Structure formats: C-alpha cells, structure tokens
Ligand binder design. Sequence first.
Ligand code: SF4
Length: 86
Amino acid sequence: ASAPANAVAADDATAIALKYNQDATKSERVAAARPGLPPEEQHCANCQFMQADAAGATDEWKGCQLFPGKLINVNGWSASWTLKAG
Ligand code: SF4
C-alpha cells in the first residue's frame, strides 16, 4: 500500500515527459491506447522497458529505465509503455 520514500513523482520532469500517472486506473492509458494489449491491461508491470531488478525494488514499486534512484508503481503506467514482447 504505502508509497516508498523514493516514489517517482507524477510531476517529475521525467513523469511529465512520459505522462507517468502512477495509478493506471486514472491513467490516460485509456486514451493513449498503446498497441499490443488493450489499455485496461497496460501498466509498468507489463512494460518491456521496466528494470524489475531496480536497486531497491519491491513488489508494488519497481524501477523504470528512465527513472533511476526512484521507483514507479507497477500498477502505474506511462506513454512509452510497450507490452513486454521481449
Ligand atoms: S516506460 Fe514502462 S516502466 Fe517506465 S514508466 Fe513507462 S510504462 Fe512504466
């Protein structure tokens, strides 16, 4: 439940550029509708680019390639998601 001290801020420069919503339920994913899988089934957990092996990862909060020294919620989402197809 509780967010980690280093939660990626939704309003971080990176989160802005990426449109990282932190919550997939509220996420613009619905509109952004990335290819691969329907928006409802998209979140960081399924993201090709996610560093699961983040230095400090935990189940709810994994690392994103572009967001070092913070963690993104696995049930969050951003624009450059891409369904894990590799
Ligand atoms: S690139 Fe992937 S892991 Fe990183 S914030 Fe976007 S959806 Fe999440």
